[PDB]
Design a protein around this motif. Sequence first.
Motif, PDB file in Angstrom:
ATOM      1  N   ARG A  62      -0.610  11.798  -0.160  1.00  0.00           N
ATOM      2  CA  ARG A  62      -1.189  11.333  -1.783  1.00  0.00           C
ATOM      3  C   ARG A  62      -1.516  12.513  -2.295  1.00  0.00           C
ATOM      4  O   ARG A  62      -2.888  12.759  -1.183  1.00  0.00           O
ATOM      5  CB  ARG A  62      -1.851   9.942  -1.641  1.00  0.00           C
ATOM      6  N   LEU A  78      -2.680  -7.457  -3.045  1.00  0.00           N
ATOM      7  CA  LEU A  78      -1.921  -6.371  -2.169  1.00  0.00           C
ATOM      8  C   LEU A  78      -1.204  -7.100  -1.023  1.00  0.00           C
ATOM      9  O   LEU A  78      -1.670  -8.159  -0.676  1.00  0.00           O
ATOM     10  CB  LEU A  78      -2.933  -5.823  -1.242  1.00  0.00           C
ATOM     11  N   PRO A  84       0.436  -1.389  -0.107  1.00  0.00           N
ATOM     12  CA  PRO A  84      -0.009   0.106  -0.032  1.00  0.00           C
ATOM     13  C   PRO A  84       0.708   1.579  -0.350  1.00  0.00           C
ATOM     14  O   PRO A  84       1.810   1.532   0.666  1.00  0.00           O
ATOM     15  CB  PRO A  84      -1.089   0.266   1.277  1.00  0.00           C
ATOM     16  N   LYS A  85       0.565   2.431  -0.402  1.00  0.00           N
ATOM     17  CA  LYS A  85       0.970   3.416  -0.614  1.00  0.00           C
ATOM     18  C   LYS A  85       1.942   3.980  -1.792  1.00  0.00           C
ATOM     19  O   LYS A  85       3.447   4.194  -1.066  1.00  0.00           O
ATOM     20  CB  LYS A  85       0.970   3.976   0.759  1.00  0.00           C
ATOM     21  N   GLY A  99      -3.965  -0.439   4.057  1.00  0.00           N
ATOM     22  CA  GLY A  99      -3.848  -0.705   3.203  1.00  0.00           C
ATOM     23  C   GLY A  99      -5.185   0.119   2.321  1.00  0.00           C
ATOM     24  O   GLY A  99      -5.853   0.526   1.703  1.00  0.00           O
ATOM     25  N   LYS A 124      -0.373   2.792  -7.037  1.00  0.00           N
ATOM     26  CA  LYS A 124      -0.837   2.212  -7.450  1.00  0.00           C
ATOM     27  C   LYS A 124      -1.497   2.451  -8.546  1.00  0.00           C
ATOM     28  O   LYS A 124      -3.184   2.283 -10.006  1.00  0.00           O
ATOM     29  CB  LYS A 124      -1.741   0.895  -7.138  1.00  0.00           C
TER      30      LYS A 124
HETATM   31  F1  BEF Z   1      -3.663   1.809  -0.819  1.00  0.00           F
HETATM   32 BE1  BEF Z   1      -3.419   1.657  -2.153  1.00  0.00          BE
HETATM   33  F2  BEF Z   1      -4.011   1.472  -2.576  1.00  0.00           F
HETATM   34  F3  BEF Z   1      -3.437   0.099  -1.847  1.00  0.00           F
END
Ligand code: BEF
Lengths: 417, 417
Positions: free
Chosen positions: B366, A320, A180-181, B337, A184
């Motif tokens: 972000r 993920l 995550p972060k 996430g 994507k």
């Molecule tokens: F937080 Be990301 F969209 F995997």
Amino acid sequence: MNLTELKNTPVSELITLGENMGLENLARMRKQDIIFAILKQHAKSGEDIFGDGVLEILQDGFGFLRSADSSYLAGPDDIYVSPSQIRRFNLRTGDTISGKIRPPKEGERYFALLKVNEVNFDKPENARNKILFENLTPLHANSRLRMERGNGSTEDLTARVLDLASPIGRGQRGLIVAPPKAGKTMLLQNIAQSIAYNHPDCVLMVLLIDERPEEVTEMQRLVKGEVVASTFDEPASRHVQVAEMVIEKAKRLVEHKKDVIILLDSITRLARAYNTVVPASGKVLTGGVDANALHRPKRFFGAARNVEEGGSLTIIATALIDTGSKMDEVIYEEFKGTGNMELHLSRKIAEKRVFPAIDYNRSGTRKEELLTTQEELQKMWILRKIIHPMGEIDAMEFLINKLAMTKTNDDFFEMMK
Amino acid sequence: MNLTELKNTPVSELITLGENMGLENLARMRKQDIIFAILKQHAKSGEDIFGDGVLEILQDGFGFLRSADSSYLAGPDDIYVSPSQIRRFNLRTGDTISGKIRPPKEGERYFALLKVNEVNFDKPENARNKILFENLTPLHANSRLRMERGNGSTEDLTARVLDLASPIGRGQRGLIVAPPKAGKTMLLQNIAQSIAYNHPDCVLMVLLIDERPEEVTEMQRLVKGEVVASTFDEPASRHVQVAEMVIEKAKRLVEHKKDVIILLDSITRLARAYNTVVPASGKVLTGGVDANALHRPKRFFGAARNVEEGGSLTIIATALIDTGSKMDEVIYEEFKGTGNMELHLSRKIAEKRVFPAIDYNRSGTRKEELLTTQEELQKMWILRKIIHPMGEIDAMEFLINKLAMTKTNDDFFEMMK
Ligand code: BEF
Ligand SMILES: Nc1ncnc2c1ncn2[C@@H]1O[C@H](COP(=O)(O)OP(=O)(O)O)[C@@H](O)[C@H]1O
Ligand SMILES: Nc1ncnc2c1ncn2[C@@H]1O[C@H](COP(=O)(O)OP(=O)(O)O)[C@@H](O)[C@H]1O
Ligand code: BEF
Ligand SMILES: [Mg+2]
Ligand SMILES: [Mg+2]
């Protein structure tokens, strides 16, 4: 008199039309109720009404025609499809049906279908004789789906790096593994824009299950294609239903030699939904995963294949990892032996604000010689052998600094020698 | 004759008023009973009584008007709301209702509502026609909610570091990840004070679930806003009820184009409460988390969004890590996430008594370009590229020593070049 035409009209014009037709006050009324009343009043004059939608056969035997603007949600304006017509035309879930409809009479709640005019955007005589999707011979990716823009834009660097790391062809079944972060969202947006720009003939479908609505309405107003999403406010049952409808529509389109592209961003969320909707069997594996929960996502992923007779089905799912939950870790790799393509993204590179943060070392594509020429494959091999000794961040910086000098990768390859 | 006015009055004046009205001895009586007797005696003379509160529709169909000073706890002075009026005005849970009330007659236990005067601090004619919260189009953070005081105070260093690490805008959905004994209390106090000082127009709501009563009464007498809390002495059912009431009130306020800010400090405790109140299904995941226990906190977190038509909803939750329980490691996570802002705090820096102990490396936001200018974003990027090589403690010491020299961060950025 089409349903989608009245759905695209604004609220003010529909209210004005309803007031001109002489009905009850439509200002304090829903748009769907306004459309329903307008259709009733127009059918009272004797004129015909037409509609369309994707068929969803129920377990009892009947079905409805879902709409794409509502993410295939159960609506009051769904067209009822009798099982007699289903048995007469051999209709299945996913067949696009467009024919004359009539308002519901006394004791009915949905529109009825009288005569079907077009099936799957084609004549019914061509749909009655067709080969099922389960009988088509699979094949490897043959046609090259180049992602490079070619306009020399600054955003084309991501597409160039993607082409140098993992070229994508028709029928490819890949995975976008990223913590995550990492970026994507921007990467998926760039991929969708490059697909819509380079290959506008392909049917692009973006599936977003269990995502933040703001992101849904952002993706819907950014990409040039169809967007079917289901926010987290909906139960896992709607997620499963949407996934089934999307995959059935994709199969029905591929059966007519169409190039379907599915950009999945919630394979992990879909697996979680399937593990939630499956009845408990008293046996739980490591991490909280049921033994029969991953079968449905397994089939949904494996549905992607290249057809020799015509058409293809591409599914690019983003998995993920490092989410703190062992269930997602068990899922991701259970699926790792899958995706004939892994595009890993590094969190360490994303923390340095180096976009794109792509792990070029662990990326790659199997049977890449079927999508690239001999000299191109040799140049990619040389570039990989030069990049491999350097570190991830250093290799990314080198690649960015070398791609910023020119517009096309051919000039970079020629200057490397 | 208002309920809140009598609730704000002290005990001595109410006892004196009751003794002047000629009733039973009020010295050995509860304040609520005193207010009830005063209202009865005043209504026996023929005068009208008015009240207000947040509506809580029960499952049967009726409801009550909870009070904010009691953290939406079931009180004897709750105003009964008949389902007929609910069906007549389309009332839902969270609608602020203010109208004439009457004491309960023989055989009744709660005040009845005769005529509603004001709905959601607005006319009922504006509330009867409204768009639901589930239909509003989400968007990213557009308006900048600057946290810097600007008065040159020594406590402004925390706000300056927060602005340099992760700027916060309207509709943001972030997470404050920090191990215990790191300084979450002081950081939350500083954030609340900066919000109340810089943006007094926004509706600030601080939710403290399963915390100590001393911290509750401290936060209530420190921040300039509304404080709804529920100590650990209450069961998880009251926690769930308070969370539902708060989120429903926030949604009802956002529906009227209001800027709601929710500072959650117990997302982990809320997830534990939801996992405790959910019936056992015979399937337990890794760490002791139910498969359907995280759905309600997931929706509560995802409720935060920015509305294009008007208003916004900001939810800043503080997650707990390294607490020795694997459930929190899965519970706090699984949520990693989901959000789009992580402000990590380092225990190693907190042990050195270096306040604030913020992990600048792993922090970030972000789409930060939508809240900062081009030159500001470039300066932040340069500062991050300079800070990244140095260690956490060294970078924090450098940042503190450089921010102590000046009052504004603009001077620091100008001196860095
Ligand atoms: F937080 Be990301 F969209 F995997
Ligand atoms: N190509 C890119 N260029 C600039 N910033 C990016 C890029 N990709 C990602 N980011 C930054 O990373 C943040 C999160 O990226 P996202 O795609 O949402 O990651 P994920 O989908 O893995 O959570 C974005 O808000 C953006 O600021
Ligand atoms: N900004 C600060 N300045 C000085 N001391 C702090 C600061 N933040 C935290 N502390 C110290 O850390 C202790 C615990 O901080 P707290 O906010 O309660 O951490 P957490 O909420 O993570 O448990 C406080 O009692 C305080 O003494
Ligand atoms: F102990 Be701290 F409040 F997380
Ligand atoms: Mg994402
Ligand atoms: Mg604390």
